[PDB]
Design a protein around this ligand. Sequence first.
Ligand SMILES: C[C@]12CC[C@H]3[C@@H](CCC4=CC(=O)CC[C@@]43C)[C@@H]1CC[C@@H]2O
Lengths: 10, 241
Amino acid sequence: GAFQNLFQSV
Amino acid sequence: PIFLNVLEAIEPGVVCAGHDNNQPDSFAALLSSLNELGERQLVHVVKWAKALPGFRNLHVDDQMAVIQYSWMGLMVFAMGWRSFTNVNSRMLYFAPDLVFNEYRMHKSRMYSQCVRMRHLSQEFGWLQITPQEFLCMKALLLFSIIPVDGLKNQKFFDELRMNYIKELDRIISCSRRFYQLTKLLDSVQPIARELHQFTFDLLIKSHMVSVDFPEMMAEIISVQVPKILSGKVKPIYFHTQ
Ligand SMILES: C[C@]12CC[C@H]3[C@@H](CCC4=CC(=O)CC[C@@]43C)[C@@H]1CC[C@@H]2O
């Protein structure tokens, strides 16, 4: 989930 | 020129690696710093990509996928450009605080890969690549690697890729030039593949060699990069290899 978390955070 | 206005406007600025240049060069230190630089640049690549013309046309899963597949090529291509503009390809300008001379190329254990990257850098000179050509080509690299079995919405991707090819052609003897630039774009992919293999192998043995991988790098290299190395995800070449 680390990439997705970045992606969704902006 | 709306499209080029946007590409110039969204282009990331300077990213430092945080490398301690006072420490003697070592494989572990150089590679740990490269890994941290990748983690930092990833943040910029995501912010840049999400701001690209038409990018939101893609299914959100595909938006995430193309970034996770294409980052190596994107970053190598930009690095080659920085190397060309800053040190006339004399060294690999990974970051202002992480510039590779030949000694570092050797100590990194990536000399062959660095050679290829320096060659790419030199091509920007040999072909007299313009900033506007560079930006359009770099954008196209985001849309140049996909799963063999297709994306979630392949149609929206195909349309987007088509339009970025059209934007490149319009920025572009024209046939000669288009041939040259597509050849240069293709040349990024074998370099990216060699780096994919190298970083994957390094991650697996990272504990044995004191090389640190940050969180996103470790995740992406273990979850997504193997799809490329196993052949499930492949580059799109212009010319047959
Ligand atoms: C993947 C890697 C860390 C990230 C590096 C990569 C070499 C290419 C590169 C160029 C950049 O400008 C950002 C960092 C990256 C993307 C390195 C090769 C081995 C190392 O593990």
